[PDB]
Structure formats: C-alpha cells, structure tokens
Amino acid sequence: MARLKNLPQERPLPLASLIEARENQVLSMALAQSDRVQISLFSFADGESVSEEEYFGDTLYLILQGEAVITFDDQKIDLVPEDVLMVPAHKIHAIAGKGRFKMLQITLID
Amino acid sequence: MARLKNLPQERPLPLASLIEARENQVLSMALAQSDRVQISLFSFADGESVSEEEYFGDTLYLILQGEAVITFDDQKIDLVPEDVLMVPAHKIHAIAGKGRFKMLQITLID
C-alpha cells in the first residue's frame, strides 16, 4: 500500500523543523512508502553528498532552509529558501549546498 | 505516463509565487499528471471553498502563505506559513482560510 509517513498528524510543524542540518553528516527521512512516488527530506552541507544523478522520472526540489546549487549540462543554477525547481526524467544533474541546507525532494518512479 | 508539470525548470521561483491569492475567487493549479499522486497548488480566502473532504489515500497539506484552519472530528487545528500536516486516508476534514492563503496539497490515489 502507498502511504505517507513521518509527518505530523495532530500538531502542525514547519517542514524544515523535521530534519536537522549538520556540517559533516548527511541526513535523510522518507515521507512516503510508495512504488509510484518517492518523497524525502534531506540535509547536508557543501559537496558532502554531491553525486551526479539521473532519474527515470521527473523530480521536484524545494529548498527549505539554506542555499544550494544545481548543476546540469550547461549551467549552475543557484537556489535560496522557498525556491522550487523541476528536473525532468533523464536529465543528469547534481545538487550541492552553499553551506548547510535542507530540501524536500519528490520523484516520480515512472 | 506520470509527469510533473507547471513548475520552473530553468529559473527557480518560490512556490507561493506560482499562484495568486484572491479574496473572492478560488484558484488551482495541477503540478502533476499522474494516476498515483495528485499534487496541486490552491488559494482561497475564508470559507470560499470549505467543502468537507474524505480521500481514499493519505494527504499532506503545506501552507505556503497566509493562515488556515483544518477541522476534523474533535478539533480545529490552526496553521501558519510553512506548517505541514498529514491527514490520513478516510479522515473526514475541511480546510478554511483565516483570510487569504496559499497551499500545496499532495494526495496519494491509493
């Protein structure tokens, strides 16, 4: 079964408050158990993660806190809190922090 | 095919900036074309919409701008910008603005 998880149901909280940010560690939390959609919170700093990724489905990134940079093909795109960017299926890309940051990722597995 | 849509791909924007808010009108924008997940932006004011809803899948609400109140069963829960609340499948609920507001809704069709 598809289900949302790890989110408040009785007292609302800011989404950024659900994950810490660390200088030297990468943190992640799944917000869905689903075969059709992956929804995750992530935090890291600088290039502590920074793998090149290429997903089979479309992805939206939402910056919750801090600044980040996304790289693909021709461009470095800078992001600040509240920015959203959609990266289409099969677009090779990488994301890195400009310092510490927190983001929400939604990816279609499709 | 499942796909994300109506989101910037080359210049990031704040999610709240993608929809206006109006006193007397309800606005909506789909951010996905999918059979597995519904992702939408909505804005309205007060009880201009305010239907009681009951979804077959889990829903997360994220307040982008303005204030809102969610009602279900025993409780009125107040929300402010950046708050997230998850409302599980089959929980009857209603959402109303405390004035104008904008929100993101993610609902599993499952």
CB contact under 8 Å between A36 and B36, yes or no, is yes
Distance of CA B8 to the CA centre of its chain: 19
Give which of B38, B59, B82 to mutate to test A binding, by max A Cβ within 10 Å. B82
Chain B residues whose beta carbon lies within 8 Å of the beta carbon of residue A15? 62, 82, 84
List residues bridging with A95 in a β-sheet.
A70
Contact call for residues B90 and B98 (beta carbons, < 8 A): no
Domains observed in chain B: 2-110 (2.60.120.10)
Closest Cα in chain A, distance from residue B28 (Å): 17
Q: Which of residues 67-106 of A touch B (CB under 8 A)?
A: 75, 77-80, 82-89, 106
Burial class (CB in 10 A: 0-12, 13-18, 19+), A52: exposed
CB contact under 8 Å between A84 and B16, yes or no, is no
> In angstroms, what CA-CA distances link B33 with A3, A97, A108, B73?
19, 30, 11, 32
Q: Kindly provide the resolution of this structure in angstroms, with one decimal.
A: 1.6
| 3-class SS of residue A94 | strand
